[PDB]
Write a protein that binds this ligand. Sequence first.
Ligand SMILES: Cc1ncc(C[n+]2csc(CCO)c2C)c(N)n1
Length: 333
Amino acid sequence: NTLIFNISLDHNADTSIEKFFTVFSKKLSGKLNKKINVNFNIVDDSFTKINNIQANKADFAFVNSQAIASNNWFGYTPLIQTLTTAFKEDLELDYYEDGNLQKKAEKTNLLFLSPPYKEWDDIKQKWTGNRYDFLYEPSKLVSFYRSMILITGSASEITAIKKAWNEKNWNQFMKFGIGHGQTNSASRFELPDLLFRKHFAKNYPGLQNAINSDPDKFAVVRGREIGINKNIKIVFDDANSFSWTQNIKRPFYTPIDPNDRLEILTYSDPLLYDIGIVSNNLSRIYQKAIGEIFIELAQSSEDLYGPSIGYNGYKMINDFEKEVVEIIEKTYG
Ligand SMILES: Cc1ncc(C[n+]2csc(CCO)c2C)c(N)n1
């Protein structure tokens, strides 16, 4: 018997990926009293992964939490919630109506600016091979993440960007240039979009409508490349992306003027971290076994894949509605 997983590689996962599956296979064969070999295909996009499983081309994969449902007819079942190590200034899940999104960003700025990213060192900033450990609370796992909005520019520009924000003047704000991702990206499009609807009120048309209405004021820009394109001084990213983006001696997260600033304006509402889904072509017993093997590797610190992509733990999902859907509903409505 043989299974097929879909897997994404980040950092140096590829150097240990084969052994991880040799291990996984071993443990799965033990649990199931059978010789079972687990192969993998490398796949990046959640919708391809989901489509593969629904097409009986794959048995298991981790996918964006907002891309799935728990539905008897879908051909897969949500199996495990991935967990990630909390960031220091964000141990607790909360929303815009809790007032802490901007203030959490401010606290994080304190840790992040001095020293500046470009001077970060593997030893001083405690690079683990996957992340700069000085930004995390290793004794704490959480099941959520957020988007963040980075801003950059001269000292007076940064003051004008913040001014526009606090006054809730959308047209003034957008005129600084906004860098985004694909329209189906939570961190680089949807979460920022939702945050604006909550923050800006009437004057907000929605992000896509704004882009159509004034294309020159928007562009696709990665957070790590902010400042590179003048004309775009506001950029969306996964919250605290610099934490797992290794500074290697232009530098990332670094303006093209040493006098210019770069900081986090605010965070977005939260979303659940990725979820492992499993094919319904497998018996419930096989499904649970797969899930347990992940949980157990994490508990024994023998998981050599998870951490490479921010999966520092796992837990079983027992009530998807309560544990997933109701959480997502507070962010998306
Ligand atoms: C160590 C590490 N931490 C976080 C990420 C980014 N990431 C991986 S899965 C996920 C949630 C769904 O987007 C995010 C933000 C990474 N690549 N590596």
